[PDB]
Ligand binder design. Structure first.
Ligand SMILES: [Zn+2]
Ligand SMILES: [Zn+2]
Lengths: 191, 6
């Protein structure tokens, strides 16, 4: 039946991934506390970032059992990075630091999500998809909200739920070209 | 578009 994750299971699996981020010096420094626009002198910050996130807040969420399942933790991690890549310029120190944190995260999260029964821990598709030649802006919980182009955006890798345990798994990870699931997808664990 | 930076 439906998998429920208890707080201590999520904390013990995931916290090392967050620690790996905190370990980065200088890179984690701008991410260790909530952005304070007065202190930092950036009064436009909450004009651009509608839903702030930082390492301390994620830590507090883990410590207090605020995540019901681990994709929610992954989403906050990417909300944090996506906010910073939005607010800050590509040539800025804080943007480059953010890209380093994301690299570290990508390398840490997969075996840890695998230990929790998931296919992997990866949020985004690997490449932009080929194209054919206001309010709360919610496409995705990690996408910073909004109130001529380059085709370099990544979409979230789409999910299918296991009908037995209720875990969200990637379509591209668990659905294969030569297998059909007439009665709905069941993950290998639950099989 | 982009913020005043930090
Ligand atoms: Zn996957
Ligand atoms: Zn399952």
């Amino acid at each position: 039946r439906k998998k429920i994750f208890k707080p201590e299971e999520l904390r013990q699996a995931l916290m090392p991934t967050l620690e790996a981020l905190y370990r980065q010096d200088p890179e984690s420094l701008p991410f260790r506390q909530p952005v304070d626009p007065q202190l930092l002198g950036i009064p436009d910050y909450f004009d651009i970032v509608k839903n702030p996130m930082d390492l301390s807040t994620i830590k507090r969420k883990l410590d207090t059992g605020q995540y019901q399942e681990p994709w929610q933790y992954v989403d906050d991690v990417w909300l944090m990075f996506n906010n910073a890549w939005l607010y800050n310029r590509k040539t800025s120190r804080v943007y480059k630091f953010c890209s380093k944190l994301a690299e570290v995260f990508e390398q840490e999260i997969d075996p840890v999500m695998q230990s929790l029964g998931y296919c992997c821990g990866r949020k985004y598709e690997f490449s932009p998809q080929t194209l054919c030649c206001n309010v709360t802006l919610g496409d995705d919980p990690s996408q910073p909200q909004t109130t001529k182009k380059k085709n370099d955006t990544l979409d979230p890798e789409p999910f299918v739920d296991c009908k037995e345990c209720g875990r969200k798994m990637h379509q591209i990870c668990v659905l294969h070209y030569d297998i059909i699931w007439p009665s709905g997808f069941v993950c290998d664990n639950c099989l | 578009g982009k913020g005043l930076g930090k």
